[PDB]
Design a protein around this ligand. Structure first.
Ligand SMILES: OC[C@H]1O[C@H](OC[C@H]2O[C@H](OC[C@H]3O[C@H](O)[C@@H](O)[C@@H](O[C@H]4O[C@H](CO)[C@@H](O)[C@H](O)[C@@H]4O[C@H]4O[C@H](CO)[C@@H](O)[C@H](O)[C@@H]4O[C@H]4O[C@H](CO)[C@@H](O)[C@H](O)[C@@H]4O)[C@@H]3O)[C@@H](O)[C@@H](O[C@H]3O[C@H](CO)[C@@H](O)[C@H](O)[C@@H]3O[C@H]3O[C@H](CO)[C@@H](O)[C@H](O)[C@@H]3O)[C@@H]2O)[C@@H](O)[C@@H](O)[C@@H]1O
Length: 123
């Protein structure tokens, strides 16, 4: 079994992540875009982060999202102890997925990343 949780506001066009082989973001004050398996969701503002490429057997085990009307910030840790971020600003409020396995990242995006809808197993 698994579950999901949504973060952020009501704007943007919905998207579905197509896998969890790599993640990058564009960010400034907010998350301008999330780039999942090379596929860009969001706008062209901000600056491009390095790409995080998951190794064999590697998955997101902890993730913190700051959000308000948009996604402000993302950070994550993997089951191999590697970290991504934080990227973004210090606005919004923080919520965390703790001791999980992320299986799919969906969301909604326009000029910014408005929302994330994270599907995961809770351990
Ligand atoms: O970057 C790509 C582009 O960048 C450019 O910048 C243009 C960018 O500009 C315009 O928006 C910027 C900015 O303008 C105003 O100041 C506000 O509208 C502002 O929005 C805030 O304030 C309004 C008014 O209160 C709220 O309704 C908003 O929800 C938002 O509110 C948060 O932030 C406020 C300021 O801090 C706080 O007071 C609020 O309390 C609230 O704060 C909460 O949330 C924060 C974020 O999570 C958090 O930090 C806080 O702690 C707190 O929790 C706005 O950002 C604008 O032109 C915009 O365009 C969009 O709207 C137009 C007109 O309707 C559309 O034509 C356009 O397609 C855009 O809409 C799409 O994108 C939206 C975002 O993804 C999406 O929601 C929407 O559905 C559409 O898909 C724009 O992108 C330019 O240089 C440009 O060239 C460019 O391409």
């Amino acid at each position: 079994s698994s579950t999901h949780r949504k973060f952020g506001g009501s704007g943007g066009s919905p998207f579905s992540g197509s896998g969890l082989s790599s993640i990058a973001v564009r960010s400034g004050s907010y998350l301008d875009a999330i780039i999942i398996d090379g596929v860009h969701h969001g706008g062209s503002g901000g600056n491009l982060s390095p790409t995080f490429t998951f190794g064999s057997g590697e998955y997101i085990s902890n993730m913190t999202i700051r959000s308000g009307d948009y996604i402000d910030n993302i950070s994550f840790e993997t089951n191999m102890g590697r970290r991504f971020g934080p990227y973004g600003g210090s606005g919004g409020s923080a919520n965390t997925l703790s001791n999980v396995k992320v299986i799919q990242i969906n969301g909604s995006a326009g000029d910014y990343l408005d929302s994330l809808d994270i599907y995961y197993e809770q351990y």
